Structure formats: structure tokens, C-alpha cells
Design a protein around this nucleic acid. Sequence first.
DNA 1: CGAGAATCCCGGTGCCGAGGCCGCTCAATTGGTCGTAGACAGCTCTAGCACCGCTTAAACGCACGTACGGATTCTCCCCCGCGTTTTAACCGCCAAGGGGATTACTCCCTAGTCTCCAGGCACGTGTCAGATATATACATCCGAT
DNA 2: ATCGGATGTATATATCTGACACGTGCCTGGAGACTAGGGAGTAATCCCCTTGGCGGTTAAAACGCGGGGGAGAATCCGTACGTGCGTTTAAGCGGTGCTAGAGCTGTCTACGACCAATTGAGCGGCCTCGGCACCGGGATTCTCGA
Lengths: 103, 107, 93, 93, 84, 84, 98, 98
Amino acid sequence: AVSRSQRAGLQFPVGRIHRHLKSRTTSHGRVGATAAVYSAAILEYLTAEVLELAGNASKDLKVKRITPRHLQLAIRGDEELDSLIKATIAGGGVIPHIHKSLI
Amino acid sequence: AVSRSQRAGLQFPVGRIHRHLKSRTTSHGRVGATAAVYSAAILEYLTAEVLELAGNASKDLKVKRITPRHLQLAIRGDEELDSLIKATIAGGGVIPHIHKSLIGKKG
Amino acid sequence: TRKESYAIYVYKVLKQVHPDTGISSKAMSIMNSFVNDVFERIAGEASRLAHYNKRSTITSREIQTAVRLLLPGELAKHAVSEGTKAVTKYTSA
Amino acid sequence: TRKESYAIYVYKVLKQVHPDTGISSKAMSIMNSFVNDVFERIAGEASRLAHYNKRSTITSREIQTAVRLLLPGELAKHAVSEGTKAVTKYTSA
Amino acid sequence: HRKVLRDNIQGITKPAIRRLARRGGVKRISGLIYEETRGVLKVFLENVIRDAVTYTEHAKRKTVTAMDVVYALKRQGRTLYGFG
Amino acid sequence: HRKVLRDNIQGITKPAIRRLARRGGVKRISGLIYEETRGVLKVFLENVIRDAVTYTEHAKRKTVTAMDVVYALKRQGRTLYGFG
Amino acid sequence: KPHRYRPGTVALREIRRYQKSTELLIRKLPFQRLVREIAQDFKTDLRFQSSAVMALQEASEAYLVALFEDTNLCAIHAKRVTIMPKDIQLARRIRGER
Amino acid sequence: KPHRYRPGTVALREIRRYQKSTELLIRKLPFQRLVREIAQDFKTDLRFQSSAVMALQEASEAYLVALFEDTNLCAIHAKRVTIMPKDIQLARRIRGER
DNA sequence: CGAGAATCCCGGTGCCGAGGCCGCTCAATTGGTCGTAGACAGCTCTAGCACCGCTTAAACGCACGTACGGATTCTCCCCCGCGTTTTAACCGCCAAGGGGATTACTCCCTAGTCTCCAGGCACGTGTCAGATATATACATCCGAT
DNA sequence: ATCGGATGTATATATCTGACACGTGCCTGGAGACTAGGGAGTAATCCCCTTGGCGGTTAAAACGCGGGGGAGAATCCGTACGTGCGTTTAAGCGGTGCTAGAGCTGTCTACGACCAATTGAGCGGCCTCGGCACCGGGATTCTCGA
């Protein structure tokens, strides 16, 4: 018995996502096996993309663990991720910026 | 063989809406019979609400038929309907309005 | 090659409200699109509401909560009044 | 009562991409919510697109088109490359 | 078992509004800003609480929940992360 | 069979931009407004046309359709009535 | 001297005319050529439907009119009567586009 | 004479402090009381979860901060340094709220 | 503080699009059966609500001063209005062929049902990452020269 | 330009704790093995409509020029808001108590789906004449300068 998540060389579950996908179709939907694997790789790439940026900011602050403050810095620091993610992070604060006229 | 849409005293279909609803639910999803009847009543009321205001706007222009321009005048003129319908009417124009400061000669 | 539309129902409602008024083809198409838009919004809201509470069916309670969530104020109260009157009429019939 | 979460997989990815840094509970919850949001968007777009073409099957083409429609630019390009590599790796086994 | 509240919008004090404005990044504030902000906040809270109360009414419950608040915020297109 | 187009953005002329502004309800127009408007229109058209092309490419077709255009506009939250 | 109007009254007359009228404002053939020029980048050798082109023109004009109205609001707020590129940029920035 | 700062520097110092900080700014008990009073109109004799109240507080604070940023942008555009109710109204109007 | 120009009504002519009629066909109705979704009833026990007292951080009211918002002139140059000369959009007509829309045939991919056992979830425990003071070191701020 | 006290702010020091991180034990859900059938791919064909081109016409665009009104820059007044101090208020934290109400498990019971006729409702095609578009001629109302 070889797990489907290991045949494709991924970390995210494939069978669990296949179950979730089949429960969100329209009253008769058939879900292909290949569809779940394609969607699993998308989630893994995006998760690995954010944690790369957040981890970089944590090292710059000479700290080890990642807090919600670091997640806000990475997302707002990125231009694409900022466009993709418009939700509000709890406890994330704001990016420091002062306009030229006020000084 | 009485109609199901006639038992509820409506004009919109009930069997057709029930079929449409059943092909929109999630997997292994059921649809109650009274859900179609309740949903058809809302659709008829909203259609009757819009059409009444459109006819009133048309009648002040001494015309007999309703054009897309009359739909824009009725929808944008009303308050609650405007907050509900945000789409673009093809050929509906705009509502005439000029700002107070733009009108020159200070009069 | 059969298409489906709401043209006859829109015409019946129009003849009910304004007995001596016409309609243009473009206006009829716009009305069809608007009706489809509302129907789709209501269906999506009802399906999401049913999924939230781990249910598996769509009922008048789901539809009423959806229309209360969508329609604002006066429209919402009048619409739920017509809905419940239609439902009790259908049930008594 | 058992509750399902993505915490284990998120921690696996974090350990792969940064072998020393850790995570906090609030950050893990935020990542869980973000993953759920993305998955919901992808599923909704794929289902709508499949209904749009008078079909009833969700295969890889709809998901690829959905991620192309949603993700912008080089994010979409890299995601498509990763997805097709994963698909070929699966089929060639 | 129950109680009544008569006027609670004055609990949003002037220093609190000043601190919010400082975090937003403004340098000098007028006088009517406090009243305008109180009105705007009241409107926003009324909308969100109405949606949340509808959600908790539909479920035949008696206590409002953070999950219902999150659903209401998502419905208004103001998605919030970090609460489920 | 095919051809090429070198610079077609100049077809949006100054009288056309002025008429759009008049319908919008402005009284006096500056000089750089035309170039700025051309840039904005180009960006908006690029986004909408890219979405429509993705939609028509998914269906293995070769002709773009009004249904695809309407679908792209709805996906961008700019729903249009009067075309199906 | 020949009859000459003052700056502004003819502008107001055009405002009234184009606010009560309801037809298209941009030339159809140049718009079609621009649409084809833009679309040839994504995929080569495409064909179009007249209804699709008309829908694109409709949406473009509606968006431009809305943006111009917001720009006029900004210009009125800044105690001026002329719209400016900075007004356009401020409106687009507040609306959350770029 | 006692040392006195010029008007303005303390404002900038507070800006830096509250921009680098990441905690809440309004008093939790008055916010709770206001939320309960507002919610009492729609239904009588409700109960609340502390997580729900906190989530409402965070959402309200984020909305207020964003609105104040937009208002400051409007005030800067109007060639001023002080924010005004007209700036607030213009920002809310352009964002399409009322 | 009148005459020229733009607009608004008013009447006549024609024309093609909305409304009604007819044929038809396919999906809404009606019984009858059957499986399971959930509507209640009962029970557990979690936490939301309500007091009580001490600490002290933070609103609150008052004084004073200064700097920023309007108000007022003043200059110049930039966009508006109008007349001439190009130009290419528009309409009508024709022509050819690519590609969209159906139809029939076949095949293969996925859902369903058993077996089976091993990744994830709950729970418990440890130790070290990070709050917290804090005593300097110093980087600006503003009055004075 | 100094220059120089005053004072917020950043650093490198113990210290103490509670919060991540890992080890364990299940157990519910993911992974093979057949089987059936229904949806989708593929090939063939019809014909709609999209593209390309030609010619006349005229409305619209481009160009140029005169000038008047609006944008922007300086200059002043004064008043409203920021900065400090001394009081006064209630938020906050730490306990204790208690019951209303959120979850969790079982039981039928009443719902809704499937299936086989079957027939009327609604869609497609066809007319037709009247609502509406267009054109021409007065009537009226602004508007600018004597």
C-alpha cells in the first residue's frame, strides 16, 4: 500500500482533498483522480511560498518562532501576495509609513 | 390535473423552478417541495416591484412600450432597488445631474 | 433546439400590474438576465446556509433566511410576507 | 470529537523550507484559515466552470483553468508548472 | 437576569479615537472628527451585528458565536483570519 | 488570411474622450487627461480580454463570444445586463 | 462683431445633451481594431463576434463614465473646476486599483 | 523655563509608537457594553462569546484604521494637514458606502 | 437692459417590430413504493453572567501659546469657441470558406461495495525562547548665542 | 553656524515562566480488488456567419487663432488645537458562585426521490397593422452688449 500523496511526491493529502472536492460539486458531479492531485500541488506551492517570505523576516528580527506580526510583514511586503490575499490578519499591525508632507 | 403554480396563486412556474434548484444543490442534496413555492413567490414579487416603477416612468413620457432607458430611470431613482441591483443596463444612460458649483454666473 | 426563458411569465406579471402597457425585446432580455441573477444568488446563499449547519436539504427556512440576508429592509419584510402567504395557501390547497 | 486540520502538513512544509524556525499557534490558525479560503475559491470556480460547458466531471483541465483565472501572473505560471509536474509524476507510476 | 443600557457610544473616548488616528498616520485632527467617527462606527457595528443575529437566529440558538461573526464579515466582503 | 496592427490606441480621439467626460458631468478638462485615460482604458481592456480569452480557450473554440465576455465581466465583479 | 459664446455655456449645453442622450460615444471600427490589437498578444489568429465587441464597448464606456464622475468629485473637493491626472490617480487609489 | 516641545513632534512620536505596536486601542469593557446595547435591538436576552466580542473589536479597529488612512490621503490632496468631516465624507462617498 | 440662436412643440408619412395565432412535442402531473434525515426527548457539564475589593492607569478639566486655515489680491498662460480643410467611417452589396452546431458510435474511467490496517487526533509532560527590569550610551530637541 | 543640557530611545546584561515540541495510544478513514455503465472522445456532415474587398458620401476629426477666465503664488489675522499639570474616575485583575444553555445519543416518523404513462403548456414559425422614428415648420426661451 503506497499513499497517493507519496506517488506524486507531495506533502498535502490527496485522498482527503478528493473527499472534500466530491462534496462541493453539483448534485451529480464526478471527480477525477487526477483533479485532486493537481489541486494538492497548488496548495503546497502557495503554502511554501508564504512561509519562505515570513521565515525571512523572522531571521531579520533575530527571533526564532513565527508570530502573526511576521505574516503581515511578508504579505504586505510582497506585491502579488498582497493582491491575492485581502483578508484581515488579527494582531498583524500595519506597515510603518509616514508621508513626506507631514514631516 | 391542476397546476402546482396555480395551487399557490402565482404566475411564475413552480415545477421548472424546482428542477432548476435541484440541479444547483451540493452532492447528495435534496430540495423540499415548499422551497420551490417559497422561492417562486419572491421572484414574482421582485419582478412586479420593478415593473410597476418602470411603467410609471414610461407613462410620464406619453409612450406605450417600455424601453431599457425606462428601466434605468426606475431602478436608479428608487433607493432600495438601487442598493440591490448594481449591474450595468445596456443602453440605459445616466440620471441627469449638475453640481451646484459648476453652474456658472454665480446664480 | 429548445431554449428556456421567463418571457411569458414576465408578460403575465406586466399585464397584471399595468393592463395596457407594452415591452421591448431588449427590456425583456434585461428582465430575463436580472431574474436569472437573483435566482442564482438565492440558490448559492441557500446552499451555503445548508452546508453551514451540516444539513442536506433546502427548505422554506433556508430560503427565508437567505432572502432576509440578501434583501434590505422594506423589501425583505414585504418579500417574506408574500412568501409565507403563498406557502400557507399552497399547503392549505 | 475529532476535528480535521492542516496543521501537520503546514508544519511539514515549514520544516522542509526552513529547517530551524518554528511557528506559533495563532500563526498556524491563520495559515489554516488561508488554506481553507484558497481551497474554497478553487472548488467554487471549478464547479461553476464545469457547469458552464454542460459537463458533469471535474478533471484536471477545469482546475488548471481555474487557477489560471484566479492566480495572477508568475504565481499562476509557477503553479501550473508544479501542477503538471505532479500530474506527470502520478501518471508515470 | 436582565438589564438595560441607555447611552454607551460615549465610552469610545477622545483619546481612543486619537490613538486610532495616530496608528492610521495622521498628524493633526479637527473637533467634529470624534462625532463623525462615532456615527460611522455605529453604522458599521449595526450592519455586522444584524447579519450575525440573523445567522444565530437561523440555527435556533441563543448565544452569538465568533463563527457567526466570521461568517457575517465574510458575507460583507471583509474576511477575517485567525478565528476559525 | 491575417495581418498586423502597429498602434491603434490613438483611435480613441480627443473628441471622443471629451464626449465621455461631458456625459460624466465635468465642465473643464486639462491636457494630460487624454493620455491618462488611454492608459487606464488599455489596462482595463487588457484584463477583461485576457479573462475572456482564457474562457474561450478552455472550451477548445476559436471564436470569442458575448457569453464569454459577460462571464469575464461577472468574474471581475462588473456584471452587465442585456446580452444573456 | 460675430456672435461668440462665453467659455462654459456651450460646455454646459453639451453636458445636458450627452446626459439626456443614450447612444454610444466611441467609433466602432477603431474600437474593434484596438480590441483585435490587444487580443492578438494572448492568442494568435482569433475571431470575434459582433455582440462580444459591442458588450466590450458598453462595459468600457460605463467604466469610463463612472471614473470621470469620481474624478469630478475629487476636483470639486480640491476647490477647482478642472479635472487633473492627480485627481484621476487619487480616485483610482482610493477605489483600490493601483 | 520648563522644557516644552514644539506642537507636532509628540504627534510624530506617537505615530511611530502606535505604528510599531500591534495591540488593541479601545477599552474592552466599554466596547462590550456598546456591542450589547446595539445587539439588544434586534433580539432580546442574548448572550455572547468572548471570542466573538474580540473578533468584532479587531474588525472595527481595522476598518477604522483603513478609513483614517483614506481620510488622511484626502486631506493631503486638499493641501492641508488636518483631517475634516468633509474629508471623511468624501472618502466614504468615493468608496461607495452612502 | 433686443436680436440672434438653440430648443420645444405640433402635425404628417411611412415602416418594421411587437402581439397574437397555429402545430407540435417533451417535460410537468399523478399514483405507488421505499429508504433515511431529522424532530424531539433526555442527560451532561461548560462557561457566561453577576458580585466584591483593592490598585492604579488613564480620562478629564484647565491654561497658555503658536502655527495653520482661510481671506484677499495679483499675474499670466491655457483651454475654450469658431471657421477651413482633410479623411476615413459608414452603408450597401457581393463572395467564399472556416468553423460552430448536431448525430452516431464506441470505449474507458469513475462510482459503488467490501476488507484491512496505519496516518492523524487527543492527551500528557518537559525545558528553553522570550517577556520583564535595568543601568548605561547616546541621538535628537529646543532655547540661547 | 554652534552648544549644551534634558530627555526619549536603543543595548546588554539575570530571571522566571508558560508555551511549543515531542512521545503514546487508539480508531476512523484512506488504500487495494472487481464490476457495471454511463459520460465523453472521435469521426462525419451541414451550413451559418465571419472575414475581405469595392465604391460613393458625408459627418467627423485635425488644424489654427484670438482671448478671457481660472490656477497658482504671496501676505496677514486670529483662533482653534496641541502640550503639561493636578484631580478624579472606573478599567482591570483576582477570587467565588451558579445556573442557562450548548453539545451528544437514541427513536420513530414523516418526508422526498424513482419509476411508468400521459397529456397540456410552452417554444418555434408566420403574419399584420399600428406605435414610433423621421421630417418640416412655427413658438418659445435664453444669452450676450450695448
